[PDB]
Amino acid sequence: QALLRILKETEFKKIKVLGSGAFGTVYKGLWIPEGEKVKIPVAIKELREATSPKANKEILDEAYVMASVDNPHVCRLLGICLTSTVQLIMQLMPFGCLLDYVREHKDNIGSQYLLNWCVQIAKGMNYLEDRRLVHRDLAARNVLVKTPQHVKITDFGLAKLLGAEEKEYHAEGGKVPIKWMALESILHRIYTHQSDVWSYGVTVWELMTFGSKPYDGIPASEISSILEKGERLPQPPICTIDVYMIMVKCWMIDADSRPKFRELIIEFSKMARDPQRYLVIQGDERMHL
Numbered sequence: 311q312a313l314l315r316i317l318k319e320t321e322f323k324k325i326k327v328l329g330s331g332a333f334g335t336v337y338k339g340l341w342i343p344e345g346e347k348v349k350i351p352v353a354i355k356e357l358r359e360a361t362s363p364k365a366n367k368e369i370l371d372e373a374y375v376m377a378s379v380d381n382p383h384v385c386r387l388l389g390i391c392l393t394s395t396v397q398l399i400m401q402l403m404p405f406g407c408l409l410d411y412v413r414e415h416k417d418n419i420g421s422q423y424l425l426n427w428c429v430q431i432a433k434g435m436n437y438l439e440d441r442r443l444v445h446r447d448l449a450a451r452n453v454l455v456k457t458p459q460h461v462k463i464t465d466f467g468l469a470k471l472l473g474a475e476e477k478e479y480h481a482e483g484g485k486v487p488i489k490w491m492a493l494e495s496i497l498h499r500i501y502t503h504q505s506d507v508w509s510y511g512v513t514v515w516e517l518m519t520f521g522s523k524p525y526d527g528i529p530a531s532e533i534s535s536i537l538e539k540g541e542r543l544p545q546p547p548i549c550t551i552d553v554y555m556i557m558v559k560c561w562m563i564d565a566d567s568r569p570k571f572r573e574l575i576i577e578f579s580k581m582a583r584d585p586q587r588y589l590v591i592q593g594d595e596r597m598h599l
């Protein structure tokens with residue numbers, strides 16, 4: 311197995327809590343590696359305590375999968391701290407997650423950034439697939455902006471190997487939001503790369519709507535029926551039909567008829583070459599020839 315860096319609680323401190331959840335608490339903080347002047351801003355994810363021996367065996371699995379992935383569009387682990395409670399330490403992304411980012415800047419985002427982000431997210435998922443990993447929680451909130459030109463996937467807490475037995479530690483946490491999940495996931499607790507492709511669909515939709523809540527104001531109990539009827543999220547205003555066609559293929563009920571991530575890379579790369587053809591945004595200017 312891998313060798314992970316282990317840090318002393320004294321090497322760093324938690325300034326403030328970026329977020330809170332069933333998973334646990336994640337803080338913003340500062341980290342001075344020993345024998346180094348440099349001060350590094352970090353995110354510190356303090357996990358929830360396990361409530362069973364088997365979950366207590368598994369609570370660190372998250373850190374090992376995160377440490378084993380090496381890809382520019384997937385976030386990495388700096389190390390763990392075990393002193394009292396389990397803490398994963400990662401690089402802070404000061405621009406924050408994409409969901410908030412597109413909300414903060416809905417007036418200022420050009421078509422080229424939106425389509426390049428879709429390419430980057432798909433590349434990272436395609437990497438995870440090559441490694442037999444199923445993320446199970448892809449969402450705009452789980453994509454972080456290192457830079458406008460660089461975005462990364464994250465929240466590996468629910469990630470698992472394809473076909474693996476469900477972990478006892480995953481079951482002791484809160485449930486995934488239904489509104490990003492594929493129908494087969496909802497009905498039978500099946501998860502695959504193709505169920506991740508569905509959540510990519512919703513994620514794209516979130517970005518193209520500049521951060522709207524999927525199925526807003528609807529009860530999660532209705533969602534399974536809606537999907538069975540055949541109803542799907544609407545075409546975002548800025549999207550041409552080519553873009554919406556792609557989202558809609560991601561929500562097809564036969565999982566093996568949805569696109570593969572490698573196909574999404576090709577399609578969205580093509581659009582990102584000529585972005586104003588595929589996304590129509592006011593204030594988006596293409597220079598005259």
Ligand SMILES: */C=C\C(=O)Nc1cc(Nc2nccc(-c3cn(C)c4ccccc34)n2)c(OC)cc1N(C)CCN(C)C
Pocket residue numbers: 328329330336338353355400401402403404405406407408409410450451452454464465
């Ligand atoms: C989508 C909300 C969000 O992440 N907001 C956010 C994030 C960051 N920076 C940052 N950098 C690395 C890791 C994380 C992070 C945060 N959470 C909750 C995580 C869970 C699992 C894995 C990684 C996680 N976050 C940031 O940098 C300062 C600011 C920020 N915002 C936008 C603060 C205000 N919002 C929370 C409303």
Ligand SMILES: C=CC(=O)Nc1cc(Nc2nccc(-c3cn(C)c4ccccc34)n2)c(OC)cc1N(C)CCN(C)C
Pocket residue numbers: 360361362363366
């Ligand atoms: C991670 C939590 C954990 O292991 N708790 C635990 C364990 C034992 N001893 C013990 N010995 C064998 C099995 C178990 C056990 C505990 N839980 C929750 C199980 C669930 C399924 C199957 C087995 C177990 N527990 C035990 O015997 C006195 C008591 C507790 N607690 C409830 C400790 C209190 N709290 C930390 C949960």
Ligand SMILES: C=CC(=O)Nc1cc(Nc2nccc(-c3cn(C)c4ccccc34)n2)c(OC)cc1N(C)CCN(C)C
Pocket residue numbers: none
């Ligand atoms: C082998 C059966 C078993 O451990 N059942 C179990 C137990 C607990 N809670 C719990 N809490 C504290 C201790 C234990 C415990 C379980 N076993 C077997 C022990 C042996 C010695 C000492 C303590 C224990 N168990 C618990 O949650 C509170 C859940 C379960 N199960 C999931 C039922 C598993 N059963 C079908 C085998």
Ligand SMILES: [Cl-]
Pocket residue numbers: none
């Ligand atoms: Cl490249």
Ligand SMILES: [Cl-]
Pocket residue numbers: 580583
């Ligand atoms: Cl082309």
Ligand SMILES: [Cl-]
Pocket residue numbers: none
């Ligand atoms: Cl061409």
